[PDB]
Structure formats: C-alpha cells, structure tokens
Ligand binder design. Structure first.
Ligand SMILES: [Mn+2]
Ligand SMILES: [Mn+2]
Ligand SMILES: [Mn+2]
Lengths: 306, 306, 306
C-alpha cells in the first residue's frame, strides 16, 4: 500500500501481459532538460511499440512509483541531478525522509520483482571494482540479482570494473549469465571483454524459455542477459574504451589507489570524450529496450500457453 | 514450540508494544559473579525505565529463551564463561546437545526476528578481520544482518577489525548503515574510525521512521545504527584505542600472522589496560540500550498510528 | 509440476520415511559403460540395505527427475560424459533447452530441499579455489548450502582447493560444519587437512539430532557433515594426495596461474595415478551413503517421535 503502481502497469500484471521495468538514471544524468525527458519518452516508446508496457520506477516525495504518469516523468526529469542515487539499501531512508530517489539496479529489481515484473531493462550493471582484493568494493547489484528471481537485460559490464571477477562473483551467487548471440561476454562500450560468455542465448524466445523455466522452478536467483553493443555504435564505444584504457594507464603511472581510484578513472574519461559516453549509453539502453521488450512479449506467450 | 518466549515479551509483541532484544554476552564475560548479573539487571532496567520490554536471549539446557526470568538470568550469570559462544550456525547443535549458549549477534538477531522483535541492542558487531584478503575471516554477523529485517543498535566496529572493508561488505549485503548524530562512522572505543558514515540519522524518531519504512516495504535485509561513544567515556575508549594501535604495531614488528593475528591483538590489549575495556564495553551497551529503547518506543508509536 | 518425483520417493516423503538424495556424477564420470551404471546401482543398494529410499537426481530431456527408474538410470549412464554438468544456476537453461544434465551439489541440493529431502549424500563439495584472492573463484555449492536447509554428507574438501578459506567462507555463510568422529577436518583423499574441525559429531544419531533441531528452528541455512576417508582406502588416498602435492609443486615451478591453474593440477594428478582417484572417489561415496542412510533413518525416528 506504500507502493504506487500505475493503472496501465497493474492491469497488465493482472492479465499476464508483457511489462518491462526501467530504472530512473537515463533521466537523472542525461542531456540538459528537457532533453533527458525526451530520451526517457523515447525509451518508453520503444517498449510500447514492441507491444509491452514500460514501467519506469522511481521514488517521488517518498512514494515508490512503479509506472510513471506524464506529469511524474516530467517532474523527475526537471529535478535532474538533484535526486538521491538510491540503491536497495537506501530505499527505506528515502521513503522515511520523503525524498526523491533515482533507483539503481539493486533498488529497481527489488521493486520490479515485488510486483511480479519479470523483465528489467537497464544499461549496465554494477560489479566488482578493480583492486577489490584490497578494498572489497563490490556492487550490491550482484547480491541483489543472486536473490531476486528476475531477468536483467544489460549490455554487459564496464571495463572500468573488474569483469573477470564480476563474472566469478555472479557464478558464486548462482546468477545465470548469458551473452546474446555471441560466445564473448560483452564489456559495456565494446563487445571485446576478453572473457568467454559462461552461456549463450540466440533469440528473445530462447531468453523467454529460460525465464519461464526459472519461474516454474521457483528459483530465488535471477538472470543476467548481456547484449553486445550494436556495430553501428562501435566507433563511439571504441573511443570510450580507448579513453578508459588510457585513464587506467595514467592511473597506474600516478599511483592512484583506494577510494580515489574509481572516481579518477571516471573523471579522466569524460575530459577526453565529452558527450560521446552519454550517446553510447543511450544507444545501449535503447537496444536493450528493443530486445528486452521482445523477450517480455515472448514470455507472456509462454505464460498464456501454460 | 521449541522456543520459549516470556509472558511479558509475548504480551508486548501481541499488542505491538516496544520490545528491545539483548544478547547474552555482557553476562558471560562481565565482572566476577554476581557483578555480571548486576550489570545485566542494570541494562534491563534502562530498557524498562524508557518504556520498553527487555528481551534478553540465551539458550538454557537446549531451550532457546526469549525474555529471561529472574531465575534464568541468575542461572545464566552463575554459569559465567562456561557457556558456549553460540553463533547462528551453532544454534542447532547447542539445542541438540541440550547445552547452554550465549548467543552472538548473528544468533540473537535470528531469534529476535523470528518472533517479531524489531530492535536489537548490542555492544559492537563482528566484521571483516584484518588481512581477510589472505584469510577470508569475516563475521557471520554481516551475512545475517544482510538477510534479516531487524535493526541492530551498536556503537560501531572495533579497530581490531578492518573497518573500511566491513563497511564495504555491509554495502554489498544491502544493509543500511547510519551513524547517529555524526558524519563519521564510529569505531567502538573511539568516534574516530577515519571512515565517513555512509548515512546519518539524528534522533530516535529518525531511526524509527527508517525501520517503519523497511517493515512496510517487506525488505529482507536489516539495518545497522552506529552510536558513537559518549564523550564521558572517551578517556577510557582512547586508552583502549591507544593500546590497540600499540598492539597492532607490535604485531607487525613480530610478524604475527594467520590465525594467531587476531588473538594476539586481543591478548596484548588486555595486559596494558586491564579492566578499562570492560568498563568501556558496559558504558557503550548502556548508551545503546538508552537510545535503542527510545527508538523502539518511537517505532511502536508509528505502528499504532498505521 | 515440472519436476517428476518417483512413486517410491513421493510415498516415502508423504509418510516421513527416510530418503537420501544422490547426485548424478558417479554416473557421468565413472568407469566405462556399463560399469558406471553398476557403481550407481551399488550406491543405491547401500542406501536401500540400510532402510532408506535412494533419490538419485538428474535432468533428462529437460525433465528434473527426483528418484530414477531402472530405465532412467540406464539411460543416464549410457549417455556418459555427454551430459551437461549442471550447477544450480544452469538448471533453468537445461530445462529450457530440453537437455540432459548431471546435477552438481548446488543443483542437487536445490531439488532435494524443494521436495523435503533432508539428507543429501555426495562425494566432496566444491570450495574456495587456490589463489581466489586474485580470482574470486568460489563454488556456488557454498552459497547454496548457506541458504538451503539440508544436510550434505561429504568426505570433506579436496586439497586441490583452499581448505582453510573454504572453512572460513562456510562460517560466514552460517553453515554448520562438523567432522565425523574426529577433531580434524578431513581433506577428501586424506584425513589430514591441517585444519581443526569447527565442530564434531560422533554418531548418526548425533547428526540426526542436529538436523532435527535445524528443522524445528526453521533456519534457512544448511549443514555440512564431513566424514574422513576409511583407513582401508588411506593408501589410495595418500597416493592421490602425494600426486596432488607434487602437481602443486610443479605448478609453482612453472608459474601456472589464472584460469589455467586449477585445470593443470587436475590434469597432472591423473597422469601420475590413473584410475586410483576414481577408486578412491567411489569408496568415499559408498562410505558416505552408509553413514548418510543411518543418519536419515535416525532422523525419521526423531520425526516419528514428535
Ligand atoms: Mn561500491
Ligand atoms: Mn571469524
Ligand atoms: Mn568456479
């Protein structure tokens, strides 16, 4: 009764119809207003055009909202960076303080699974940070997915993170990880992570069959589908990856360590590449929304045929 | 039906009244009998005077007891160090062998949450040990709190442990961590850990609002509130911290490693400081009982107003 | 309705009678057909002779089977190595693709616990790999047991793995670990791991009392019983351990690291020792089946006496 579900989303959920959850970060960190709103509308339209209902999730004035109205999407967008970045562990505090929160992967998948949404489209997922051996800095996204039965549709893991260790951690958490139409696990900006995909899926229908099986089994762990960046944005992605490897090199040369390591890398990449990173992120989210919506629709067919 | 709940505690729980869980360690390792009993009575009295019901938890002759009678508290106290230190994973064995067990944070929070107690007052919580990178020695307290929806009221984490890594681990487990009336996460004996508080709460009512939100959301992860040592015991705490840093230094100089590392540190500190450590621990538990009881009462008001 | 339970197993479960779960690996990697089938029959017969019902678990043509018919055991055995090694996170994919899967400890304990089987006999359990500090390579067996209330009957952990870190990890996951009739935690092939047992049990009845307590408490974490290799196979085990320590030495000398480390060790041991490893594994599984069946029967008595 604390959570507000939009009528479009609740009616779809009642009848087993396709719903795609979305997080509130394309909005809080996009282009200058009202361009971030326009991007959010464009992503929701991709979901709608493919036959699913988009369920953008955010917290507004302490109210968790699953499915946003036009007014709510506008309000969220005009707030811009002023919203609290809200991980799962932050939800109760944002509710208690009646704040506005843009939910991360861990928080969004909590709310999506709470109400029975099976497919959550994101950009990337958090992971094991570089030099986690000394810091233990590991995203709660990985824990959350290990104990929430939901499918996350991502473009992989950023090379700023430790991708091999992220994959190992996901194995240990019992998360099924599959690359989409590839034997290589994608990094976010490049298809080349250097890591073999632990498993492979080749169509939205393949994906839906795995989700359907997971639901029928009542497993409490989730699924990560990783969709490699489209070749039409490989130039933008390759630029970011080149800048990232340069930043990593400069970081080593200047002995940047500890809590300053990750923010230094992020900082240096933006100077070299400006807006191309956001452009790549938007292209990735839009690709994930397309394939994620097809997965959700294929799943609703399997559910109908039960 | 295995667990025995005292009539005072069960009647309070039936009516949504304030209850504070307590562990059985102030007793098993306090001053010489009957001084450890007197300390336990003093802590329970602080809870009672503030309008809550104290629920001390222990296992006696294989019977988990939630809420102790006068006879039971006396019996437990006279046993002294003879009781098994009982972590969550030890409970079944202590029950099976019909033993006596003093429950740790992980075991106490299991029993407290089992019966619907929302607030558990402790001294400190276990954590990531120093050089866990080589040992993986990490307290089950952290795991337990990550999957039990209960608030633990603590004075932070001892500097004998690795506080930065403990904080990271708690983030990954989706535990909401907040310092009380400070931007700094407290170490146990000193307010100065060197780590920023990941979040802050400024009153018992703030705390209760977070717990209330967590309950309404049906989140399965818990909450750590960390209350800095009162200035009136900072001298005792500073002495312990000084002795701890000296022991850490001597440990490095004598290359103490592995399973001998943590017990060496504990051993050296006691020689230098004698009884002041226990005095500091008692002051901390009594402070946590005061604030914890106020939190529990404020929470019972929120629940009444639902 | 996706899972097929044999009539013998379902009738036993309905009436609280002794059932022992078994995994499908003695079969997929045993002696040349039909010798692997004969070994599987021999293990099931040990369970039957001791008064319990054997429940071998596998996935055949996408159907999870709990309890195999004569035809199914034969079919599984004739498939040999062609079956997918199926961890818990792989189950949904094997079901979705209608494949054949030999379930590992993590997958088998999921299915066993799903239907109410309390005792699962295996050979060994997976663990923390050597140099996990750099790789984070850790078996999902440990996670799975930390959140599944079932008893696993094993002969310990292989010295190819990092046994001290595996024990620490199990503590953190809240898994009760006990050595059978010893103060030393067994390695798989040798009773000498160099690690003290965190706890000890001295009879099948002791084991059953712990399981019974765990069930009554409704704890969601499981139990690992580790049974040291019988002295009558210590020569075979000692040979394997000697070969393992030699392989470890050669690995260090040739600087084998990363993802090549574990497979190199496994590879070298087989060249030096040929079939004695399988012989030792079979002896261990058969010993675990004997004691595991006694535990299951003793537990069914406790349940009858409730
Ligand atoms: Mn982090
Ligand atoms: Mn420990
Ligand atoms: Mn592994």
């Amino acid at each position: 009764s604390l959570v507000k579900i939009s009528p479009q989303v609740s009616e779809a959920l009642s009848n087993g119809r396709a719903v795609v959850a979305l997080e509130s970060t394309i909005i809080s960190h996009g282009m200058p207003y009202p361009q971030n709103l326009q991007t959010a509308k464009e992503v929701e339209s991709i979901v709608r055009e493919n036959g699913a209902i988009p369920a953008t999730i955010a917290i507004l004035n302490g109210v968790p909202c699953i499915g946003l109205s036009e007014e709510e999407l506008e309000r969220l967008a005009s707030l811009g960076k002023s919203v609290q970045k809200t991980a799962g562990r932050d939800i109760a505090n944002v509710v208690a303080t009646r704040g506005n929160g843009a939910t991360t992967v861990s928080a969004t998948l909590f709310f999506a699974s709470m109400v029975g949404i099976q497919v959550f489209v994101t950009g990337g997922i958090g992971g094991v940070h570089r030099h986690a051996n000394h810091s233990m800095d590991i995203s709660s996204d990985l824990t959350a997915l290990g104990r929430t039965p939901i499918a996350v549709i991502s473009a992989g893991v950023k090379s700023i993170l430790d991708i091999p260790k992220t994959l190992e951690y996901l194995e240990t958490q019992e998360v099924y990880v599959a690359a989409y139409k590839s034997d290589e696990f994608p990094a976010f900006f490049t298809e080349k992570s250097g890591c073999k995909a632990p498993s492979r899926v080749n169509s939205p229908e393949d994906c839906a069959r795995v989700i359907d099986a997971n639901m029928k089994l009542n497993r409490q762990a989730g699924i990560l589908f990783a969709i490699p960046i489209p070749k039409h944005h490989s130039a933008a992605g390759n630029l970011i990856e080149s800048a990232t490897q340069r930043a990593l090199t400069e970081a080593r040369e200047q002995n940047v360590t500890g809590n300053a390591e990750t923010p230094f890398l992020l900082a240096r990449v933006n100077e070299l590449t400006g807006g191309t990173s956001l452009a790549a992120n938007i292209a990735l989210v839009k690709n994930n929304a397309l394939i994620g919506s097809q997965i959700a629709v294929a799943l609703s067919q399997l559910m109908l045929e039960h």
